[PDB]
Coordinates of C-alpha atoms in Angstrom, one line a residue:
Chain A
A7 CA 18.8 -0.1 -26.9
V8 CA 15.6 -4.1 -27.5
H9 CA 15.5 -6.9 -29.6
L10 CA 13.3 -9.9 -29.0
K11 CA 14.9 -12.3 -31.4
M12 CA 17.1 -12.0 -28.4
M13 CA 15.0 -11.9 -25.6
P14 CA 14.9 -15.3 -24.5
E15 CA 11.8 -14.9 -23.5
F16 CA 9.5 -14.5 -26.7
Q17 CA 11.7 -17.3 -28.1
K18 CA 8.2 -20.3 -26.4
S19 CA 6.4 -21.2 -28.8
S20 CA 3.9 -19.0 -26.4
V21 CA 4.1 -16.6 -27.2
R22 CA 2.9 -14.8 -30.4
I23 CA 3.1 -11.0 -31.8
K24 CA 2.2 -9.9 -35.1
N25 CA 4.3 -6.5 -35.5
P26 CA 6.9 -7.0 -33.8
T27 CA 8.8 -4.1 -34.5
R28 CA 5.8 -2.8 -32.7
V29 CA 6.5 -4.7 -29.0
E30 CA 10.4 -3.8 -29.0
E31 CA 9.7 0.1 -30.3
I32 CA 7.4 0.8 -27.1
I33 CA 10.0 -1.1 -24.5
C34 CA 12.5 1.2 -26.1
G35 CA 10.1 3.8 -25.0
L36 CA 9.9 1.8 -21.8
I37 CA 13.4 2.2 -21.5
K38 CA 14.2 5.9 -22.1
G39 CA 11.2 6.0 -19.3
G40 CA 12.7 4.2 -17.1
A41 CA 10.9 3.6 -13.2
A42 CA 9.5 7.3 -12.9
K43 CA 7.7 7.0 -16.2
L44 CA 6.0 3.5 -15.5
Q45 CA 2.4 2.5 -14.5
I46 CA 0.7 -0.9 -13.9
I47 CA -2.8 -1.2 -15.5
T48 CA -3.8 -5.2 -14.4
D49 CA -6.5 -7.3 -14.3
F50 CA -6.2 -10.6 -11.5
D51 CA -8.0 -13.3 -12.1
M52 CA -5.9 -15.5 -15.3
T53 CA -4.2 -13.1 -15.4
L54 CA -2.0 -12.8 -12.2
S55 CA -3.4 -15.6 -11.3
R56 CA -3.1 -19.8 -13.7
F57 CA -5.3 -20.2 -15.9
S58 CA -4.3 -24.6 -14.1
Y59 CA -1.7 -26.2 -12.7
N60 CA -0.5 -30.1 -12.1
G61 CA -2.3 -30.6 -15.7
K62 CA -6.1 -29.4 -13.4
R63 CA -8.1 -26.3 -13.6
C64 CA -7.7 -23.6 -11.0
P65 CA -9.8 -21.5 -9.0
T66 CA -11.2 -17.4 -10.0
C67 CA -11.0 -15.1 -6.4
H68 CA -15.2 -15.8 -6.7
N69 CA -15.3 -19.6 -7.0
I70 CA -12.4 -19.9 -3.7
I71 CA -16.5 -19.0 -1.9
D72 CA -17.4 -21.7 -3.9
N73 CA -15.5 -24.5 -2.7
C74 CA -15.2 -23.8 0.4
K75 CA -16.6 -24.9 3.5
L76 CA -19.5 -22.6 3.9
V77 CA -21.1 -22.5 0.8
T78 CA -23.6 -26.3 -0.5
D79 CA -24.0 -28.8 -2.8
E80 CA -27.0 -26.3 -4.1
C81 CA -25.8 -24.0 -3.9
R82 CA -22.6 -24.9 -6.6
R83 CA -24.9 -27.0 -8.6
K84 CA -26.8 -23.9 -8.4
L85 CA -24.2 -21.6 -9.0
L86 CA -22.8 -23.6 -12.2
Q87 CA -26.0 -23.4 -14.2
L88 CA -25.7 -19.5 -14.1
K89 CA -22.1 -20.0 -15.8
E90 CA -24.1 -22.8 -17.9
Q91 CA -25.7 -21.0 -19.2
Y92 CA -24.5 -17.4 -19.1
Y93 CA -20.8 -18.1 -20.5
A94 CA -22.5 -18.7 -23.8
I95 CA -23.8 -15.0 -23.6
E96 CA -20.4 -14.1 -22.5
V97 CA -19.2 -16.4 -25.8
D98 CA -22.1 -15.7 -28.2
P99 CA -20.3 -14.8 -31.6
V100 CA -22.7 -12.7 -33.3
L101 CA -24.2 -10.4 -30.1
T102 CA -21.7 -7.4 -30.3
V103 CA -20.4 -7.1 -26.6
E104 CA -22.3 -4.2 -25.3
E105 CA -26.0 -5.6 -25.2
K106 CA -24.5 -8.6 -23.1
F107 CA -24.2 -5.8 -20.1
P108 CA -27.5 -6.4 -18.5
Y109 CA -26.9 -10.4 -18.9
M110 CA -23.6 -10.5 -16.8
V111 CA -25.6 -8.2 -13.9
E112 CA -27.7 -11.3 -13.3
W113 CA -25.0 -13.5 -13.9
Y114 CA -23.0 -11.3 -10.9
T115 CA -26.4 -10.1 -8.5
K116 CA -27.0 -14.3 -9.6
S117 CA -24.2 -15.7 -8.4
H118 CA -23.0 -13.0 -5.5
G119 CA -26.8 -13.6 -4.0
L120 CA -26.1 -17.8 -3.6
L121 CA -23.4 -16.8 -1.1
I122 CA -25.2 -13.4 0.5
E123 CA -27.8 -15.9 1.2
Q124 CA -24.8 -18.7 2.4
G125 CA -23.5 -16.3 5.2
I126 CA -20.3 -16.2 4.7
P127 CA -18.5 -13.7 7.7
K128 CA -15.4 -11.5 6.9
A129 CA -13.7 -13.8 10.0
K130 CA -13.4 -17.0 7.3
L131 CA -11.8 -15.4 4.4
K132 CA -8.2 -15.9 5.9
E133 CA -8.7 -18.7 6.8
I134 CA -10.0 -20.1 3.7
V135 CA -8.1 -18.8 1.4
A136 CA -5.6 -19.6 4.0
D137 CA -6.3 -23.5 2.5
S138 CA -8.1 -22.8 -0.5
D139 CA -6.0 -23.7 -3.7
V140 CA -5.5 -20.7 -6.0
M141 CA -1.3 -19.7 -7.3
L142 CA 0.4 -16.6 -8.0
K143 CA 1.6 -16.6 -11.9
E144 CA 5.4 -18.2 -11.6
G145 CA 7.4 -15.3 -10.9
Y146 CA 5.2 -13.6 -9.0
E147 CA 8.1 -12.6 -6.6
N148 CA 10.0 -10.5 -9.6
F149 CA 7.0 -8.7 -10.8
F150 CA 6.2 -7.8 -8.1
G151 CA 8.7 -7.7 -6.3
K152 CA 10.7 -5.5 -9.1
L153 CA 7.2 -3.0 -9.3
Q154 CA 7.6 -2.0 -5.2
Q155 CA 11.4 -1.5 -5.8
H156 CA 10.6 1.2 -8.4
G157 CA 7.4 2.6 -7.0
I158 CA 5.9 1.7 -9.9
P159 CA 2.4 2.3 -9.1
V160 CA 0.1 -0.8 -9.9
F161 CA -2.8 -0.8 -9.8
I162 CA -5.0 -3.8 -9.8
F163 CA -8.7 -3.7 -12.0
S164 CA -10.9 -7.1 -10.9
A165 CA -14.1 -8.4 -11.5
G166 CA -14.3 -10.5 -9.3
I167 CA -14.4 -10.2 -4.5
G168 CA -12.2 -7.9 -4.2
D169 CA -11.5 -9.2 -0.1
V170 CA -10.6 -12.3 -1.6
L171 CA -8.4 -11.1 -4.0
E172 CA -6.3 -9.1 -0.9
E173 CA -6.5 -11.8 1.5
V174 CA -5.0 -13.6 -1.7
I175 CA -2.0 -11.0 -2.5
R176 CA -1.7 -10.0 1.0
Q177 CA 0.1 -13.6 1.6
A178 CA 1.2 -14.8 -0.6
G179 CA 3.6 -11.4 0.5
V180 CA 3.3 -9.0 -2.3
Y181 CA 0.6 -6.1 -1.5
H182 CA 2.5 -3.9 -0.5
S183 CA 1.9 0.3 -0.3
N184 CA 2.0 0.3 -4.6
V185 CA -0.9 -2.2 -5.4
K186 CA -4.4 -0.5 -5.5
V187 CA -7.1 -2.9 -5.9
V188 CA -10.1 -1.7 -7.7
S189 CA -12.5 -4.6 -7.2
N190 CA -16.1 -5.8 -6.2
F191 CA -15.8 -5.5 -2.6
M192 CA -18.0 -6.7 0.5
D193 CA -20.3 -4.4 2.8
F194 CA -20.8 -6.8 5.6
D195 CA -23.2 -6.7 8.2
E196 CA -23.1 -7.0 11.3
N197 CA -21.4 -9.8 13.2
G198 CA -18.4 -9.8 10.7
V199 CA -20.5 -11.7 7.8
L200 CA -21.1 -10.4 4.5
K201 CA -24.7 -8.8 3.7
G202 CA -23.8 -7.6 0.4
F203 CA -21.7 -5.3 -2.2
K204 CA -20.5 -2.1 -2.5
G205 CA -21.2 0.4 -5.4
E206 CA -21.8 -0.7 -9.2
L207 CA -20.6 -4.5 -10.3
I208 CA -17.8 -4.4 -12.5
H209 CA -17.7 -7.3 -14.7
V210 CA -16.6 -8.4 -17.5
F211 CA -17.3 -5.7 -20.9
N212 CA -17.6 -2.3 -18.2
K213 CA -13.6 -2.2 -17.8
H214 CA -14.5 0.8 -19.6
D215 CA -17.2 2.3 -16.8
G216 CA -15.7 1.1 -14.5
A217 CA -12.0 3.3 -15.6
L218 CA -13.5 6.1 -16.2
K219 CA -14.7 7.0 -12.5
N220 CA -11.4 5.9 -11.5
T221 CA -9.7 8.9 -13.7
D222 CA -9.3 10.5 -10.2
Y223 CA -6.6 7.8 -9.2
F224 CA -4.7 8.8 -12.7
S225 CA -4.3 12.5 -14.2
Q226 CA -2.7 11.7 -10.2
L227 CA 0.6 9.7 -11.9
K228 CA 0.7 12.5 -14.5
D229 CA 4.4 11.1 -14.6
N230 CA 3.9 7.9 -15.3
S231 CA 2.2 8.0 -19.3
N232 CA 4.5 4.4 -20.2
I233 CA 1.5 2.0 -19.4
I234 CA 1.9 -1.6 -19.8
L235 CA -1.2 -3.3 -19.3
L236 CA -1.9 -7.2 -18.2
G237 CA -4.9 -9.2 -19.5
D238 CA -6.5 -11.6 -19.8
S239 CA -9.8 -10.5 -22.0
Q240 CA -11.0 -8.5 -25.1
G241 CA -13.4 -6.5 -21.8
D242 CA -9.9 -5.5 -20.5
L243 CA -8.5 -3.6 -22.8
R244 CA -9.9 -1.2 -21.7
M245 CA -8.8 -1.3 -18.6
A246 CA -6.9 2.6 -19.1
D247 CA -9.5 4.5 -20.9
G248 CA -8.4 6.4 -17.8
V249 CA -4.9 7.2 -18.4
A250 CA -3.8 10.6 -17.4
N251 CA -1.1 11.3 -20.0
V252 CA 0.1 8.4 -22.2
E253 CA 3.0 8.1 -24.7
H254 CA 3.8 4.2 -25.0
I255 CA 1.4 1.1 -23.9
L256 CA 2.2 -2.3 -23.8
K257 CA -0.7 -4.5 -24.6
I258 CA -0.3 -8.0 -22.9
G259 CA -2.8 -10.5 -23.0
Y260 CA -3.8 -14.2 -21.7
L261 CA -5.0 -16.3 -24.2
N262 CA -5.6 -19.8 -21.4
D263 CA -8.9 -21.4 -23.1
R264 CA -10.5 -21.5 -25.8
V265 CA -6.4 -21.3 -27.3
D266 CA -7.9 -22.7 -30.8
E267 CA -11.1 -19.6 -30.6
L268 CA -9.5 -16.4 -30.4
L269 CA -5.9 -16.3 -31.8
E270 CA -5.9 -13.6 -34.4
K271 CA -8.3 -11.1 -32.3
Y272 CA -5.5 -11.0 -29.3
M273 CA -2.6 -10.9 -31.8
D274 CA -4.6 -7.7 -33.6
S275 CA -5.7 -5.9 -30.2
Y276 CA -2.7 -7.2 -28.0
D277 CA 0.8 -6.2 -29.5
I278 CA 1.7 -9.7 -26.7
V279 CA -0.5 -12.7 -26.7
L280 CA 1.1 -15.5 -24.8
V281 CA -1.0 -18.6 -25.0
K282 CA -1.8 -20.9 -22.1
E283 CA 1.2 -20.0 -20.4
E284 CA 1.5 -19.6 -15.8
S285 CA 5.0 -17.4 -16.2
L286 CA 5.1 -13.5 -15.2
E287 CA 9.9 -14.2 -16.3
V288 CA 7.9 -13.0 -19.5
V289 CA 7.1 -8.7 -18.5
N290 CA 9.4 -9.6 -15.3
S291 CA 11.7 -9.4 -18.8
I292 CA 10.8 -5.9 -19.6
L293 CA 10.8 -4.6 -16.2
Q294 CA 14.0 -6.2 -16.3
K295 CA 15.7 -3.9 -18.7
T296 CA 12.9 -0.8 -17.6
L297 CA 13.6 -0.3 -14.3
Chain B
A7 CA -8.7 -8.4 32.1
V8 CA -5.9 -6.3 31.8
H9 CA -2.9 -6.4 34.2
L10 CA 0.0 -5.1 33.4
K11 CA 1.0 -7.2 35.9
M12 CA 1.9 -9.3 34.1
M13 CA 2.6 -8.7 30.9
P14 CA 6.3 -9.5 30.8
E15 CA 6.6 -6.1 29.1
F16 CA 4.9 -3.8 31.3
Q17 CA 8.2 -4.5 33.2
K18 CA 10.7 -3.2 31.9
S19 CA 13.1 0.1 33.6
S20 CA 11.9 2.4 29.7
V21 CA 7.9 1.7 31.0
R22 CA 5.9 4.3 32.9
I23 CA 2.9 5.5 33.6
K24 CA 1.1 7.5 35.3
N25 CA -1.8 5.7 36.4
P26 CA -2.0 1.8 35.4
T27 CA -5.7 1.2 36.2
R28 CA -6.3 4.0 33.6
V29 CA -4.4 1.8 31.3
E30 CA -5.0 -1.4 31.9
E31 CA -9.1 -0.7 30.7
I32 CA -8.1 1.2 27.7
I33 CA -5.8 -1.6 26.5
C34 CA -8.7 -3.5 27.6
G35 CA -10.7 -1.0 25.5
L36 CA -9.2 -1.9 22.1
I37 CA -8.9 -5.7 23.1
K38 CA -13.0 -5.6 23.3
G39 CA -13.1 -3.6 19.6
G40 CA -10.5 -6.5 18.0
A41 CA -9.2 -6.2 14.7
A42 CA -12.3 -4.8 12.2
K43 CA -12.4 -1.8 14.8
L44 CA -8.2 -1.0 15.0
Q45 CA -6.3 1.4 13.2
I46 CA -2.7 2.7 14.2
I47 CA -1.5 6.7 14.7
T48 CA 1.8 7.4 14.5
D49 CA 4.7 9.2 14.4
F50 CA 8.2 8.5 11.9
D51 CA 11.5 10.1 13.6
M52 CA 12.5 8.6 16.5
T53 CA 9.0 6.8 16.7
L54 CA 9.7 3.9 14.5
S55 CA 12.9 4.7 13.7
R56 CA 16.0 4.7 16.3
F57 CA 17.2 7.8 18.2
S58 CA 20.7 6.6 19.3
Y59 CA 23.2 3.5 18.1
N60 CA 26.3 2.1 18.2
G61 CA 26.8 5.0 20.3
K62 CA 25.8 7.7 17.7
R63 CA 22.0 9.0 17.8
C64 CA 20.7 8.1 14.8
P65 CA 19.6 9.8 12.2
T66 CA 16.2 11.5 11.4
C67 CA 14.7 11.3 8.0
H68 CA 16.2 15.7 6.9
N69 CA 19.3 13.3 8.8
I70 CA 20.0 10.9 6.0
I71 CA 19.8 14.3 3.1
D72 CA 22.1 16.7 5.9
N73 CA 25.1 13.8 5.7
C74 CA 24.5 12.9 2.5
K75 CA 27.1 13.1 -0.1
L76 CA 24.9 15.1 -2.7
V77 CA 25.7 17.9 -0.1
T78 CA 28.6 20.2 0.8
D79 CA 30.0 20.3 3.7
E80 CA 29.5 24.0 3.1
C81 CA 25.3 23.2 1.9
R82 CA 25.8 20.8 6.0
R83 CA 27.6 23.7 8.0
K84 CA 24.9 25.9 6.8
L85 CA 22.3 23.3 7.5
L86 CA 24.4 21.6 10.8
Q87 CA 23.7 26.0 12.0
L88 CA 20.5 26.1 10.3
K89 CA 19.4 23.4 13.6
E90 CA 21.9 24.8 16.1
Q91 CA 19.8 28.2 16.3
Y92 CA 15.9 27.7 16.1
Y93 CA 16.3 24.4 17.8
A94 CA 18.3 26.4 21.0
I95 CA 14.3 27.6 20.0
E96 CA 12.9 24.2 19.9
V97 CA 12.8 23.2 23.8
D98 CA 13.9 26.9 24.7
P99 CA 11.8 26.3 28.0
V100 CA 10.5 30.0 28.2
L101 CA 8.7 30.5 24.7
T102 CA 5.3 28.8 24.6
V103 CA 4.0 26.0 21.4
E104 CA 2.4 29.5 20.2
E105 CA 5.3 31.4 19.7
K106 CA 7.9 28.6 19.0
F107 CA 5.1 28.0 15.9
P108 CA 6.7 31.2 13.3
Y109 CA 10.3 30.5 14.2
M110 CA 9.5 26.3 13.8
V111 CA 8.1 27.8 9.7
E112 CA 11.5 29.5 9.3
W113 CA 13.9 26.6 10.2
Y114 CA 12.2 24.4 7.8
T115 CA 12.0 27.2 4.8
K116 CA 15.6 27.3 4.9
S117 CA 16.0 23.6 5.9
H118 CA 14.7 22.9 2.8
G119 CA 15.8 25.2 0.8
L120 CA 18.9 24.6 1.6
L121 CA 18.8 21.0 0.3
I122 CA 17.0 22.1 -3.1
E123 CA 20.1 24.1 -4.1
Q124 CA 22.3 20.7 -3.3
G125 CA 19.6 19.5 -6.6
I126 CA 19.0 16.4 -5.4
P127 CA 17.7 13.5 -7.9
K128 CA 14.8 11.3 -7.1
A129 CA 16.9 9.2 -9.1
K130 CA 19.6 8.5 -6.0
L131 CA 18.0 9.3 -2.9
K132 CA 18.0 5.3 -2.9
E133 CA 21.8 4.5 -3.0
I134 CA 21.4 7.4 -0.2
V135 CA 19.2 5.3 2.1
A136 CA 21.4 2.2 1.0
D137 CA 23.9 3.2 2.8
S138 CA 22.5 5.4 5.8
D139 CA 23.0 4.2 9.1
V140 CA 19.7 4.5 10.2
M141 CA 18.4 2.2 12.2
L142 CA 14.1 0.9 12.5
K143 CA 13.4 0.3 16.4
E144 CA 13.8 -3.4 17.8
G145 CA 10.7 -5.6 16.8
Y146 CA 9.7 -3.1 14.1
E147 CA 9.3 -6.7 10.3
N148 CA 7.3 -8.1 13.3
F149 CA 5.4 -4.4 13.8
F150 CA 4.6 -4.2 10.3
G151 CA 3.6 -8.0 10.0
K152 CA 1.1 -8.3 12.5
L153 CA -0.9 -5.6 11.4
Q154 CA -0.6 -6.2 7.8
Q155 CA -1.7 -9.9 8.7
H156 CA -4.7 -8.5 10.1
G157 CA -5.4 -6.2 7.3
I158 CA -4.9 -2.9 9.9
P159 CA -4.5 0.4 8.5
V160 CA -1.7 2.8 9.5
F161 CA -1.6 6.6 9.4
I162 CA 2.6 7.4 9.6
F163 CA 2.0 11.2 10.3
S164 CA 5.0 12.8 10.0
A165 CA 6.8 15.9 10.3
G166 CA 9.9 15.0 8.5
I167 CA 10.2 13.8 4.6
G168 CA 8.0 12.0 3.0
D169 CA 10.2 10.7 -0.1
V170 CA 13.1 9.7 2.2
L171 CA 10.3 7.7 5.2
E172 CA 9.3 6.3 2.4
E173 CA 13.0 4.8 0.5
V174 CA 13.5 3.5 4.6
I175 CA 11.0 1.3 5.3
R176 CA 10.8 0.4 1.4
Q177 CA 13.6 -1.3 1.6
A178 CA 13.3 -2.8 5.0
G179 CA 10.7 -4.1 3.3
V180 CA 7.8 -3.4 5.7
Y181 CA 6.4 -0.5 3.3
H182 CA 2.7 -2.5 3.2
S183 CA -0.9 -1.4 1.9
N184 CA -2.5 -1.4 4.6
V185 CA 0.8 1.4 5.5
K186 CA -0.7 4.9 4.4
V187 CA 2.1 8.0 5.0
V188 CA 1.7 11.8 5.2
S189 CA 4.4 13.6 5.7
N190 CA 6.8 16.9 4.1
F191 CA 6.3 15.0 0.1
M192 CA 9.3 16.7 -2.3
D193 CA 8.7 17.8 -5.7
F194 CA 10.6 17.5 -8.9
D195 CA 12.2 18.9 -12.1
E196 CA 12.0 18.3 -15.4
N197 CA 15.1 16.5 -14.6
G198 CA 14.0 15.3 -11.6
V199 CA 15.4 17.7 -10.2
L200 CA 14.5 19.1 -5.8
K201 CA 13.1 22.4 -6.6
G202 CA 9.4 22.9 -4.1
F203 CA 7.9 20.8 -1.4
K204 CA 3.7 19.7 -1.5
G205 CA 1.2 21.3 0.1
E206 CA 1.0 22.9 3.0
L207 CA 3.9 22.1 5.4
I208 CA 3.8 19.4 8.4
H209 CA 5.3 20.7 11.5
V210 CA 6.2 19.8 14.9
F211 CA 3.6 21.6 16.1
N212 CA 0.2 21.4 14.1
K213 CA -0.1 17.5 13.5
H214 CA -4.2 18.5 14.3
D215 CA -4.0 20.4 11.3
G216 CA -3.1 17.5 8.8
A217 CA -5.5 15.8 10.8
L218 CA -8.0 17.2 10.2
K219 CA -7.0 17.7 5.6
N220 CA -7.4 14.4 5.4
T221 CA -11.0 13.3 5.8
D222 CA -11.5 10.8 3.0
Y223 CA -9.0 9.0 4.4
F224 CA -10.8 9.2 7.8
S225 CA -14.0 8.5 7.2
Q226 CA -13.3 5.5 4.9
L227 CA -12.9 4.4 8.4
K228 CA -14.5 5.9 10.5
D229 CA -15.7 2.2 12.0
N230 CA -12.6 1.5 13.2
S231 CA -12.7 3.6 16.2
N232 CA -10.0 1.7 18.7
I233 CA -7.1 3.6 17.9
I234 CA -3.5 3.1 18.8
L235 CA -1.5 6.1 19.2
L236 CA 2.8 6.2 18.9
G237 CA 4.9 9.7 18.9
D238 CA 8.1 11.3 20.1
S239 CA 6.4 14.5 21.6
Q240 CA 3.7 16.2 22.6
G241 CA 2.5 17.2 19.2
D242 CA 1.8 14.3 18.4
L243 CA -0.8 13.7 21.3
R244 CA -2.9 15.3 17.9
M245 CA -2.4 13.0 15.1
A246 CA -5.4 11.8 16.4
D247 CA -8.1 14.4 15.8
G248 CA -8.8 13.9 11.8
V249 CA -10.3 10.2 14.1
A250 CA -14.0 11.0 13.7
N251 CA -15.5 9.2 16.5
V252 CA -13.6 7.7 19.7
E253 CA -14.1 4.3 21.2
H254 CA -10.8 3.4 22.7
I255 CA -7.5 4.6 22.4
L256 CA -4.3 3.7 23.7
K257 CA -1.9 6.6 23.3
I258 CA 2.1 5.3 23.5
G259 CA 5.5 8.2 23.7
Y260 CA 8.6 8.0 23.6
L261 CA 11.3 10.2 24.8
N262 CA 14.3 9.4 24.5
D263 CA 16.4 13.6 24.8
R264 CA 16.0 15.8 27.8
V265 CA 14.7 12.2 30.1
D266 CA 15.0 14.2 33.5
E267 CA 13.2 17.8 32.5
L268 CA 10.3 16.4 30.0
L269 CA 10.3 12.6 32.1
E270 CA 7.0 14.2 34.3
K271 CA 5.2 16.3 31.1
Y272 CA 5.2 12.5 29.6
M273 CA 3.1 11.2 31.9
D274 CA 0.9 14.0 32.7
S275 CA -0.1 13.2 28.9
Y276 CA 1.2 9.5 27.8
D277 CA -0.9 6.8 29.6
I278 CA 2.2 4.9 28.9
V279 CA 5.6 5.8 28.9
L280 CA 9.4 4.6 27.3
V281 CA 12.3 6.0 28.3
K282 CA 15.1 5.7 26.3
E283 CA 13.8 2.8 24.3
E284 CA 15.2 1.2 21.1
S285 CA 11.7 -1.7 20.7
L286 CA 8.5 -1.4 20.1
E287 CA 7.8 -5.1 22.4
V288 CA 5.3 -3.1 24.7
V289 CA 3.2 -1.8 21.9
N290 CA 4.0 -5.7 19.7
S291 CA 3.4 -7.4 23.2
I292 CA -0.6 -5.0 22.8
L293 CA -0.5 -6.4 19.1
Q294 CA -0.4 -9.4 19.9
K295 CA -3.8 -9.9 22.4
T296 CA -5.3 -7.8 20.7
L297 CA -5.3 -9.0 17.5

């Protein structure tokens, strides 16, 4: 069995739960299934990466290219106005999510374009990531390691830059065979320099659309009917709209920003909310009782 | 330029090269391609695993099951006996690959089907391999390491047993995202019990078939025209078939059994031959230069 009142990880004040007797139950079924039935669907930025360190703000994959020694100060500035002006649409309390889709496209298409202009080549991505300031949440070792141990499919579904994400986890030594990454990848040129991006622009709001185009990968994992979903946004809540068959599913969500803003929303959608947190020990603990 | 006279690895008493100048340009072809244009295609048993150790010839994927503690000495007799027969044909200098062909299937059908009679639980393959005496060739943590850090694709094409192979490399901690395994994967029932095998059998003489039956993978790598191929038999020379276009390709073959009998057969078909050897330094040294 399982009890959250007895799990030291669920006693910190940065762990809110609306339906506690809901969590324990879902976790119990996750045990009955163990590894054989386990599946994990995860976002990357601010979920598997840190939102903040030593009090300082940590970078997203896109940022690693925004603060690299290849982009100009006028790009960062021009990119900054982009966020300043578009974040406001993202966090618009009245307009509904659908009435934003076109925006994200412009936001990205406009933020990537500045990188497509800076002439950034694959060659420097390994070098650049080699010294950036990114950080995987505390316990990134127990997480990826227990999963690879029990062959638990991990589907990282990110609206960031795939090539950067793949270089980060590779350097952290966790990019194992069980990890599948689906993100916005670069469509480089002849000199190994960036020239564009592949396919549809995956962004914070179309996860519903991105997930469905992968039913492919999902029907193949029929026996992995139990899934834990790690996300940091409402949009990440759709990251699993394409799983073949579902017996149990836990929605763990990080609320790293606008804290005194969306707490009730998170308690409703996600089963578990992690308010201002930089560790995976909680999910690593649920995996302990499960694997 | 490339000169094998100076690369120490090419000076060991386990390196027999028919024509080194041809071997030196090919390697030189690999070097002019770089990472972005390289991919690996290798057999597993006796290639990435050892032929013998401490004195006793190391086990193959199947051997790990054969001798498992879940297989009765009776199950082993029927299995071991089922080997003392077809092998006599498997290495019958009389017959040809065309004839020996239908024989193999029978052997594999008889071997697996027997293992199927023992009711092997997927959940226990970990302990089984965890105590077996399997040996990965010398210099592998690095082999898999240089390749994973460079993002190089590795296609392990094995006529052994899928799941067992995955566990051996997983425990050695080298089963990275860049490693793609294609083998004879077993299937389980309700309580995870070995019932049958997925897809079309892969045996020691028809890798050309499987090589074709993997378009998505290679089509996605139609750009990696430089290839290093590693095998332990003539049949492994076909492993690079599903390969769309090839600029440069280096084939390296290990000879661990019947040395005096087959030595000349391997020299006339493998650019670089590694006679009775348990290390990969000749290939790791090529990677050190190439990447």
